C-alpha cells in the first residue's frame, strides 16, 4: 500500500495521505429476532443432581424472561444527535398494537422477510435464534416425558450452549440500560454480520469494504432493545452505511511550535488546532477533530460523519499556504514552553526547547541523533525510539515514504510583544486582526 507522509517545518506539522475512506452517511436498521417461549411454571420438585441442574437452567431462563420484561479541539461545534434514534423509532413503532403480529406472520415460512409496519417503514427482519423451536419441540418434550429427570447430561450441556446467548444478551441489557455498543458477538456473530451486509440494497463496493472490515463495522454500530411479548424478542441493530467509498483521506498532526528565546518568560508558542482526519466526500471534505471517531485499519480510514463537520475543499490547502486569502486556518496560542513530541504515521515530530534533553536512538547503535532547539522531524526507518527530557516515545514503524519538506517555521513572523496567548480556537486572519 503506497502510503505517503509529508512533514512541513513551517508549522511543524505532518500530513499522511494515501488512505481509503469509509464515511458513515446512513444507518441501516435490521430487526433481529429471537423467538422465545414464556414458560409459566417450573413445578419440578426432585432434588437429584440432573434435576437440580435442569431446574437451575429453567430458572435462569425464566429469570432472563422476567428481566427482559422489566427493561420495558473543535468538538464543541458537533451537534448532539441521537445515535439510537433510528432504533428507538423502530422500537416505538413495534410497540403499537398489531405490529408484533405482522413480524410473526411474515417470518412463519422464511428466515428473512421485509415487513411493512404501520409507520410506513419496510424493515428486514431475520430470526437468528429460534429458542422457541428448541424449547417447544426439542426440550420441553424430554423434560416433561421423563418427569423432570433428564437421562443424559448432553441435553443439559446443549441447553447451556443454546441458552448462553440469551443469558449473555440479558446480562448486557441489564448492566447497560438496553443499549449496548459495540454490538457484541452474542447479539450478532461475524457470519451473521457478513450476511446482513451482503443483503443490503446498496452498491457492491460498499459491500466489499464492509466485508473486509466487519470488525470496524461492528465497532461503529449500535444495538437497541425492543418489545418482548407473544413469544418473541426483537431488537434493532443499527449498522453503519458508508455511502461513500474509496475517497482520498489525509491526517494532520500538529506539534507545539514555540520559540527558543533566551529569556524564560518572553517566548511565544503556536499550534494548529485543526488536527485530525479529513476524508473527501462530494463538494466539501469531512473533518474529524476527535481522533476517537476515526479508525485506521490497514490504510482504510473508517469514520463517522455524525461526529464530523462539513467544510469546503480548501481545507486541504491549509497544509500548503498558511497565509492564503481563501481559507483561514485555525490555531491556538500560548506562552507555556513545555517540550513534547507527537508520533506521526511515518515519523515523529519533536519540539525540543530549553534545557530538555532530546535524542533519537535505535537499539543497535544507541543515540544516533541529538535534537537541537526547535521543532524537528525524524524518520521511521532508521530510528526505533525517541526520548525528550526523561519521557520516552516510540516511533511508528509503518512502511512508507516520508518527505521532509523544508521550510521556515512561522513563529518567527510574530512579535512576542504582541502575541495573544489566551486563545483556544483562533484563526489566522482574526489573530492578524488582533495583532493589528
Amino acid at each position: 500500500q503506497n502510503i505517503t507522509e509529508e512533514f512541513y517545518q513551517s508549522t511543524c506539522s505532518a500530513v499522511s495521505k494515501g488512505y481509503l475512506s469509509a464515511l458513515r452517511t446512513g444507518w441501516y436498521t435490521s430487526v433481529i429476532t429471537i423467538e422465545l417461549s414464556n414458560i409459566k411454571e417450573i413445578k419440578c420438585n426432585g432434588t437429584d443432581a440432573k434435576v437440580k441442574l435442569i431446574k437451575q437452567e429453567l430458572d435462569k431462563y425464566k429469570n432472563a424472561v422476567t428481566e427482559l420484561q422489566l427493561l420495558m479541539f473543535l468538538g464543541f461545534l458537533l451537534g448532539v444527535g441521537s445515535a439510537i434514534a433510528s432504533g428507538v423509532a423502530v422500537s416505538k413503532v413495534l410497540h403499537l398494537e398489531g405490529e408484533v403480529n405482522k413480524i410473526k406472520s411474515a417470518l412463519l415460512s422464511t428466515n428473512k422477510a421485509v415487513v411493512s409496519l404501520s409507520n410506513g417503514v419496510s424493515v428486514l427482519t431475520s430470526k437468528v435464534l429460534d429458542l422457541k423451536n428448541y424449547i417447544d419441540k426439542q426440550l420441553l418434550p424430554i423434560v416433561n416425558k421423563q418427569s423432570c429427570s433428564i437421562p443424559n447430561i448432553e441435553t443439559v450441556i446443549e441447553f447451556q450452549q443454546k441458552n448462553n446467548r440469551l443469558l449473555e444478551i440479558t446480562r448486557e441489557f441489564s448492566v447497560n440500560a438496553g443499549v449496548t455498543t459495540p454490538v457484541s458477538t452474542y447479539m450478532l456473530t461475524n457470519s451473521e454480520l457478513l450476511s446482513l451486509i451482503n443483503d443490503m440494497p446498496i452498491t457492491n463496493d460498499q459491500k466489499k469494504l464492509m466485508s473486509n472490515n466487519v470488525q470496524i463495522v461492528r465497532q461503529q454500530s449500535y444495538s437497541i432493545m425492543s418489545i418482548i411479548k407473544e413469544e418473541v424478542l426483537a431488537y434493532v441493530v443499527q449498522l453503519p452505511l458508508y455511502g461513500v467509498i474509496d475517497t482520498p483521506c489525509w491526517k494532520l498532526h500538529t506539534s507545539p511550535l514555540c520559540t527558543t528565546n533566551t529569556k524564560e518568560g518572553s517566548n511565544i508558542c503556536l499550534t494548529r488546532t485543526d488536527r485530525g482526519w479529513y476524508c473527501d466526500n462530494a463538494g466539501s471534505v469531512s473533518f474529524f477533530p476527535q481522533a476517537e471517531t476515526c479508525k485506521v485499519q490497514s490504510n482504510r480510514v473508517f469514520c463517522d460523519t455524525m461526529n464530523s463537520l462539513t467544510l469546503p475543499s480548501e481545507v486541504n490547502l491549509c497544509n500548503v499556504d498558511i497565509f492564503n486569502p481563501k481559507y483561514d486556518c485555525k490555531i491556538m496560542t500560548s506562552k507555556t514552553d513545555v517540550s513534547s513530541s507527537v508520533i506521526t504515521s511515518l515519523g515523529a515530530i519533536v519540539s525540543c526547547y530549553g534545557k530538555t534533553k532530546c535524542t533519537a536512538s535505535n537499539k543497535n547503535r544507541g543515540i544516533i541523533k541529538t535534537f537541537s532547539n526547535g521543532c524537528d522531524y525524524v524518520s521511521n526507518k532508521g530510528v526505533d525510539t525517541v526520548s525528550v527530557g526523561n519521557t520516552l516515545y516510540y516511533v511508528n514503524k509503518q512502511e512508507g515514504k516520508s518527505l521532509y519538506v523544508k521550510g521556515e517555521p512561522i513563529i518567527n513572523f510574530y512579535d512576542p510583544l504582541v502575541f495573544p496567548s489566551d486563545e483556544f480556537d483562533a484563526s489566522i486572519s482574526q489573530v492578524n486582526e488582533k495583532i493589528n
Partner: antibody
Amino acid sequence: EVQLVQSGAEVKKPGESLKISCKGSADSFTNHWIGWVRQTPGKGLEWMGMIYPGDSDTRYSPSFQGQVTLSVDKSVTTVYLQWNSLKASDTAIYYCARQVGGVVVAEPPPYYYYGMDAWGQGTTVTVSS
Amino acid sequence: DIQLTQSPSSLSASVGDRVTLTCRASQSIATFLNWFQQRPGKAPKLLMFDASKLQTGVPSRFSGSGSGTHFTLTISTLQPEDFATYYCQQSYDLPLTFGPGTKVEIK
C-alpha cells in the same frame, strides 16, 4: 411397580355427602399429578379433574366444575374426592390416576401430558334408596 | 370439547392377526395422543404415548403412527389377553376426553 390403593365400596342415599380416598407411595408421587376420572356402565370414561400433590392446584372439567371438590395431603400422600350433594345418576366406578408430564407448559394449548400409567383399583359408588 | 371418534366402532379378528385401529379427532392434536387398554373390572393401562412411542414394559409388538387429526395403532401378533377395550386419549387441550371404545373379540 408403583401402586395406588383406594377406598372401599361406597353406598349412600341421594342428598348427603361422601368422601373417597386414594393413597399411593412416597418417592415418585411427588413429581406426578393426580387426576380423577369417572366411568359409567355402558358409556365411556369421563375425565373429572386433576390436582398436583405439591401445590394443591386444581383444574376441573366443565361438566364437573362446582359439582365436586378435590383435596390433597402430601404429609400422608393422600388424595380425596368430596361431594357436595350426591345424585342418582352419579352411580359409577371412579378411578384415581397419576399423570406424568405437564410439569412445565408454555401458553397452553398444547399441554404436555403424556401418560396416565398407574391407576387405583377403582371405587364403586352407588346412590340408591 | 374435542370429539375423538374411533374406527371401527367394533372389530372382529383372529389370533395372531395384524390389526390396525384408527381414531380421528375433530381438531388437530399434534401427535399428543395416548393409547390405553382396559379389561372388564380392571383399571386402564397406558400402552403408548406420543401416538407412536412405546411405554417401558409394554410389549414391542405394539406400534403406532399418525398425526394431526388421524392416528392408528397396529398390533402384529394378537393374543387372547390382547383382546380388550382400547381407548385413544387426547392430551392437546382441556378437558382430556376419550373415544367411544373398541371391543376386540375373537371370531
